[PDB]
Design a protein around this ligand. Structure first.
Ligand SMILES: *[C@@H]1O[C@H](CO[C@@H]2O[C@@H](C)[C@@H](O)[C@@H](O)[C@@H]2O)[C@@H](O[C@@H]2O[C@H](CO)[C@@H](O)[C@H](O)[C@H]2NC(C)=O)[C@H](O)[C@H]1NC(C)=O
Ligand SMILES: *[C@@H]1O[C@H](CO[C@@H]2O[C@@H](C)[C@@H](O)[C@@H](O)[C@@H]2O)[C@@H](O[C@@H]2O[C@H](CO)[C@@H](O)[C@H](O)[C@H]2NC(C)=O)[C@H](O)[C@H]1NC(C)=O
Ligand SMILES: *[C@@H]1O[C@H](CO)[C@@H](O)[C@H](O)[C@H]1NC(C)=O
Ligand SMILES: *[C@@H]1O[C@H](CO)[C@@H](O)[C@H](O)[C@H]1NC(C)=O
Ligand SMILES: *[C@@H]1O[C@H](CO)[C@@H](O)[C@H](O)[C@H]1NC(C)=O
Ligand SMILES: C[N+](C)(C)CCO
Ligand SMILES: [Cl-]
Ligand SMILES: [Cl-]
Length: 523
């Protein structure tokens, strides 16, 4: 049907889902296309239109480099943009239950992709299942990534930094001002994302400007305190300048640098983003969030430590094998096409790839902590993966949770350990980074595809995620399920998610994280 929004009318399309119907509005604009003089600037308000805007298909995805490491492989290509790339990419999608709901809780998705890639139109971010099954309204948006989204010149409005985060914020505002018209409750909005998406959600919890645009938060495999999540003002400057040189835009006047960069084609900017860093890693985030003094008013770690953040409930979690996915993008001896049994020497070279500017002592300390074998040919293969996963995702997430809960709010932590039966990647990579997503969005609820055990697991996660959003408590109260306990700094209880048996456990990776959280920061 047609919904009247603050800026004009929009037309959706009906979709058949599980013997029912969901109304989708794909591609609603929420900001002025950031083209020309508007490139690198915070998103500007949109101008009211007349006629009926047709939101019947996904809009353009934002400019970004694509993963070409495995042409023709679904494992990597399922994450690549499935929509035309373009600077004109500030659009959002809405899925609403049918018949129209009266005051439905709203779930807003923020995709990940290291702040360099990603898009809301991916097959695995389809919100129709959630709308259909739990009667919630699902919203997702495209936000600028890479240099076009995070290039920074602190203090300069021509390129202030964090533009992609402000894109996200403008979309949350759109929901605040328009979701009622779709039958949604702007007072019951839960943000949820994965990877850089999760890091973005955690930053919205810290940004005063986002405080009133949402109720609760869900962080899947990511938080701002991850080593790859925030670019230092130092790195940012060197990077903006390196990009300038590489494009022949170096100028005495910094604003002239930007004007120059505003004449380059999106491709020239994308082509040179990779080289702005002397030596990067398969986890490098060339252009990401920075302390801009606007969206972020101080180093986020300080804000977290001193309780300066939105007080509300949070649901946080990570996957069993967060690090494996990155091993095949640079680690010697690794390949998705063999068991990747590596040697001590390869493990050591591996650390060089993942910890480039780290002292020799720092790398030895990582090896000492992870090589105290408990024989087996895959010891080193498994150790490098845990090293990358604990350092980059698991430990930062736990620390974030512990620090956040220390200020009074209920927090729930999960450990996702189920390996999709349809995973394209080899078994040795295990429960990979990004592969709990399809379960959260309820893809396994669709029988035409996944085992029965997977349908049941996805059905529970969906119910838990929905109950969290609506009631702030991730329980599944009807089918004699394990109760999900609150996570406290003392006992640190967490729930495991799998098909076998869900369990309550305590102090995840206790020994490993003491190393990363307490010691490693010093080297
Ligand atoms: C800050 O940037 C300099 C310059 O980086 C180089 O030039 C850029 C345009 C880009 O092309 C990069 O790939 C280049 O590396 C960094 O200095 C470089 O350091 C490396 C050390 O391996 C050296 O080989 C290069 O010759 C240096 N570049 C030059 C010409 O000075 C510098 O390391 C960066 N600062 C940091 C964060 O360390
Ligand atoms: C697992 O494969 C890696 C990657 O090698 C490539 O992919 C293979 C499947 C095969 O098609 C090779 O021809 C390709 O080169 C192997 O790593 C290579 O090992 C050789 C010798 O040890 C070394 O010279 C190369 O530099 C390595 N390449 C990389 C990227 O590290 C590895 O040996 C295989 N391990 C097995 C079979 O268990
Ligand atoms: C929007 O969709 C309607 C109905 O399909 C169509 O009549 C109209 O021309 C469309 N507007 C466009 C393509 O600008
Ligand atoms: C939706 O619920 C909120 C409380 O969460 C209430 O304040 C608001 O008036 C309701 N919206 C409707 C149905 O008008
Ligand atoms: C609860 O159990 C019923 C039947 O036993 C099943 O159909 C349903 O999917 C389950 N609900 C949840 C939320 O798991
Ligand atoms: C980070 N994503 C899951 C979005 C892409 C694959 O790593
Ligand atoms: Cl492709
Ligand atoms: Cl159970």
């Amino acid at each position: 049907i047609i919904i009247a929004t603050k800026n004009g009318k929009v037309r959706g399309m009906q979709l058949t889902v599980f013997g029912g119907t969901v109304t989708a509005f794909l591609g609603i604009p929420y900001a002025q296309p950031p083209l020309g003089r508007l490139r690198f600037k915070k998103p500007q308000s949109l101008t009211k239109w007349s006629d009926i805007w047709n939101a019947t298909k996904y809009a353009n995805s934002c400019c970004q480099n694509i993963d070409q490491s495995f042409p023709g492989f679904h494992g990597s290509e399922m994450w690549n943009p499935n929509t035309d790339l373009s600077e004109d990419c500030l659009y959002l999608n809405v899925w609403i239950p049918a018949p129209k709901p009266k005051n439905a809780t709203v779930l807003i998705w923020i995709y990940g992709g290291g702040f360099q890639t990603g898009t809301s139109s991916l097959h695995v971010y389809d919100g129709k299942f959630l709308a259909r099954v739990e009667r919630v309204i699902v919203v997702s948006m495209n936000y600028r990534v890479g240099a076009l989204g995070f290039l920074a010149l602190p203090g300069n409005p021509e390129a202030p930094g964090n533009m992609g985060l402000f894109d996200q914020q403008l979309a949350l505002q759109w929901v605040q001002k328009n979701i009622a018209a779709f039958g949604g409750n702007p007072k019951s909005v839960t943000l949820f994302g994965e990877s850089a998406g999760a890091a973005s959600v955690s930053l919205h919890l810290l940004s005063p400007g986002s405080h009133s645009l949402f109720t609760r938060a869900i962080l899947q495999s990511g938080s701002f305190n991850a080593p790859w999540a925030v670019t230092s003002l130092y790195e940012a400057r060197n990077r903006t300048l390196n990009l300038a040189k590489l494009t022949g835009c170096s100028r005495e006047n910094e604003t002239e640098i930007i004007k120059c960069l505003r004449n380059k084609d999106p491709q020239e900017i994308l082509l040179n983003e990779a080289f702005v860093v002397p030596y990067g890693t398969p986890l490098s985030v060339n252009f990401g969030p920075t302390v801009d003094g606007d969206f972020l008013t101080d180093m986020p770690d300080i804000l977290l430590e001193l309780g300066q953040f939105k007080k509300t409930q949070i649901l946080v979690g990570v996957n069993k094998d967060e690090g494996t996915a990155f091993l095949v993008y640079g680690a010697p001896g690794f390949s998705k096409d063999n068991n990747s049994i590596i040697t001590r020497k390869e493990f050591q070279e591996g650390l060089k790839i993942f910890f480039p500017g780290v002292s020799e002592f720092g790398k030895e300390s990582i090896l000492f902590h992870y090589t105290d074998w408990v024989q087996r040919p895959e010891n080193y293969r498994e150790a490098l993966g845990d090293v990358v996963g604990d350092y980059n995702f698991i430990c930062p997430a736990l620390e974030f949770t512990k620090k956040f809960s220390e200020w009074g709010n209920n927090a729930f932590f999960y450990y996702f350990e189920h390996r999709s039966s349809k995973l394209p990647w080899p078994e040795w990579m295990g429960v990979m980074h990004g592969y709990e997503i399809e379960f959260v969005f309820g893809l396994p609820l669709e029988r035409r595809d996944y085992t029965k055990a997977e349908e049941i697991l996805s059905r529970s996660i969906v119910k838990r995620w929905a109950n969290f959003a609506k009631y702030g408590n991730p329980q599944e109260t009807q089918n004699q399920s394990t109760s999900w306990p609150v996570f406290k700094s003392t006992e640190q209880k967490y729930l495991t998610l799998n098909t076998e048996s869900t369990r309550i456990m305590t102090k995840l990776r206790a020994q490993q994280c003491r190393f990363w959280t307490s010691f490693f920061p010093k080297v």
